[PDB]
Amino acid sequence: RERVIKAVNELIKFTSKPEEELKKDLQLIVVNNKSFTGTSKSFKLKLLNVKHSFYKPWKEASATAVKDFKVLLILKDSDIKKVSEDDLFDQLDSEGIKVDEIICGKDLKTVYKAYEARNAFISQFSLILADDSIVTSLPKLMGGKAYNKVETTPISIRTHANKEFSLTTLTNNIKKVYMNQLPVKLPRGTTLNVHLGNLEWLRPEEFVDNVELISEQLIKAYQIRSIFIKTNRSPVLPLYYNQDVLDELEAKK
Amino acid sequence: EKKERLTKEAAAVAEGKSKQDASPKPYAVKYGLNHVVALIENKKAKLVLIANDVDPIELVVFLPALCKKMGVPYAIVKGKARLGTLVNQKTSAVAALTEVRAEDEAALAKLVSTIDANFADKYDEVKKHWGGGILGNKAQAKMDKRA
Amino acid sequence: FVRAESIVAKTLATSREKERIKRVSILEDKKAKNETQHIASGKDFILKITEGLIREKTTYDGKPALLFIVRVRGPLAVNIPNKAFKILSLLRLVETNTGVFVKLTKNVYPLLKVIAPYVVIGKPSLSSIRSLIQKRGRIIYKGENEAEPHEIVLNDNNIVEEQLGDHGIICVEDIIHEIATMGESFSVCNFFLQPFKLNREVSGFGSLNRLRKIKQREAESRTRQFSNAATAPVIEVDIDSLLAKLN
Amino acid sequence: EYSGIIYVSRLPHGFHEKELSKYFAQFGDLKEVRLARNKKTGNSRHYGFLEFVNKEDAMIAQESMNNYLLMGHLLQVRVLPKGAKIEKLYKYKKRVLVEKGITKPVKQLKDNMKQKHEERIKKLAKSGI
RNA sequence: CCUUCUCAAACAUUCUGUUUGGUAGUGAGUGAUACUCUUUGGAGUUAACUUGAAAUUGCCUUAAA
């Protein structure tokens, strides 16, 4: 953690040297391991835990920008007859956010075809959530151009309960996924970079005890051996080296 | 369908609400001759279809020129009963697409581009060339045996 | 002439069906090998539909049953693939508007699930079986002539007393019993029965018959749905009622 | 003058060399058909070439199907001048991956990483931080 | 001129809570620095930006006639 604070302070130094502007200061973390899942690709995103969500500052941080932070929900093609928008307006501002556009799965196959219009719709959006029963079908209705990004991907939420729709469940999970979780994918190869955010947003005095838990959780999952830090330009900082993982490369075969 | 939407608005005008604003916007073709000539020179028509067989031809003989003038995508179609089918008359003599739904914007754009490439360009000769100087059968065989 | 749109659409639909069969076959084989950790769903389902239509969904847990299959056509572009053509040509189910019996058991579930979008399945009553038996159903024979590439209608019960007397089967009511009870192996009986041939529902192209055709296609499109989901249950409509119009 | 070779573009999806040949052989007898494809996970690059025999089948095909509009991409097809001799676009296949390794005993790579730690440290030293 | 994989089980009660598993694409081009293996064979991943699905040659038959 002394290494954590010193590396973050020196990256602050690195950005304090006297589009591109918002781009050049995004903090990202790199992690690698032995080898990932062979000949297979994954599309599910795992939402790590956090104590200080970075989604919640992003509202007031992007309100004053041009990227125009917005939200999408994809419900099943049966609950747009049940869940109105004023219900969410009421139940959500009492917490601090709002879901804006409810797009039925049919509007992906009727009005948002013709990829020009599809992308013209998709770029407008920042936080995307998907019915758990349609997320399995969304790669055909939205295309890999959306998957090529970390935030445009559809994020599965447990809309269904035992039993039927019960928008109370949608509510009681959307909070857990806006102010309690943090999404990231799992690709092939070894390297994975996580978007922690910009040095305009939430502070290092919480980034420390945030990276602590992100480490403590991921370090046990995939037998990882290398964790570094950078911000969009900087040389890689060695913050982790475990040789007690490279031992099974000559034990697998 | 007219009487059914009238019954629905009849219900809603007093019970819940309607100022003829409970039912959504309607989208349909425009098929009157006076109406479509007045819809050009506005200008709102997006594609004009003109039947090619009107017996008093001088009714439509002037529409292509005004269309090219005001810059409207005209196209001349084979048959006026064919037009009347999509209007629920017997003959209609013109039809116009003025406003389309959301899902059909790409369809209408590609279609007007097709009409551009196939009608506007394939026919630069049409302005000249009086047509119809065709001989009969016996007269033709006569001239072709002579020369 | 060919009119390229047809050959393009046939290719597209055929690729869809190809990869759907690929999906369901690989999933079934991966369930069969029981390395079941990287899977999709645990058990299998069956979906019953009654008359804008009420539905159910329940596990199988076989417990075999006596199913009736009737061949249908479509959908509309699919150059039938090899693995489905094989199953149909084994069940003697070429030439649609025809009907076959089958002993539904636990191991046939990986076959009807492949062939789902080409047949219609049902568990009918005793009336349907008996009336089908005594109205249709044919037998191939041989005696005194007739080198027997040729069938007949089933007038006689002595023909049965001959060709099945080893199993004590006489008087085709006994065969009706064997079917409706899944009795003495059911298999010699089914391969005797010479799978049936039912008449179409609408024969037409007048003026009133195009209306019956339109209504039939619209009701079919409403009720019979094809999933392409690689996990879909098999659908059960009322064949007790279907055979009224198809018999 | 022109060749016997014809070139097509803006093809739709699912309209590959098989159906291209089957359809365009309705204008004569064709010599060869080639379509463009990708190197990894071969998918259609939406253009290709054909050539039958005669210098007139090409013009017949062009005059017939130059602005033809099938599934919603209107086609485009040109005749080529003398020669130009189609050369390329071999038909590929999806690139399945195979793990190349591991062969080297972990010890020399362990030394590699024990060096690379300070190598990174000097790289950031000169950067410098 | 077809039309898109739109829930599975378990452990639990707080009137819904938690763990698991399920997702291979429109092509083309622009483009910043970082890693993992392997001999030189360059493979797997990595901040994000453009386009009217845009384009020229990368070694079963009564769904008939």
Author numbering:
A (entry chain K): 34 to 51, 71 to 305
B (entry chain G): 104 to 250
C (entry chain t): 55 to 105, 127 to 322
D (entry chain o): 88 to 216
The authors write:
Assembly of ribosomes requires the transcription, folding, modification, and processing of ribosomal RNA (rRNA), and stable association of ribosomal proteins (RPs) facilitated by trans-acting assembly factors (AFs). The crystal structure of mature yeast ribosomes first revealed that the eukaryotic NPET is composed of rRNA from five out of six domains of 25S rRNA, and the RPs uL4 (rpL4), uL22 (rpL17), and eL39 (rpL39). In eukaryotes, the bilobal tunnel domain (TD) at the tip of the uL4 internal loop forms two constriction sites as opposed to one found in bacteria. We found that pre-60S particles lacking the TD of uL4 harbor a misassembled NPET that lacked the densities of eL39 and the Nog1 CTD and are blocked or stalled in at least three different stages of 60S subunit assembly.
The R1 and R2 particles (27% and 12%, respectively) closely resemble Nog2 state 1 particles, containing a prerotated 5S RNP, and thus have progressed beyond the stages represented by the R3 and R4 particles. The structures of these R1 and R2 particles were solved at a resolution of 3.2 and 3.3 Å. In classes R1 and R2, no density could be observed for the NPET-occupying RP eL39, the Nog1 CTD, or AF Arx1 that binds to the NPET exit platform. This indicates that lack of the L4 TD causes significant disruption in the composition of the immature NPET. We could not observe densities for Bud20, Nug1, and Cgr1. Although class R2 exhibits wild-type rRNA conformations, significant shifts in rRNA helices 68–69 and 74–79 could be seen in class R1. Classes N1 and N2 closely resemble class R2 from the rpl4∆63–87 mutant, except that the ITS2 structure is absent in class N2. Class R2 particles are wild-type-like and likely progress to class R1 particles, which display a shifted rRNA helix H68 (gold) that prevents binding of Sda1 and progression to Nog2 state 2. Alternatively, some fraction of class R2 particles may progress past Nog2 state 2 to class R6, which displays aberrant conformations of multiple rRNA helices.
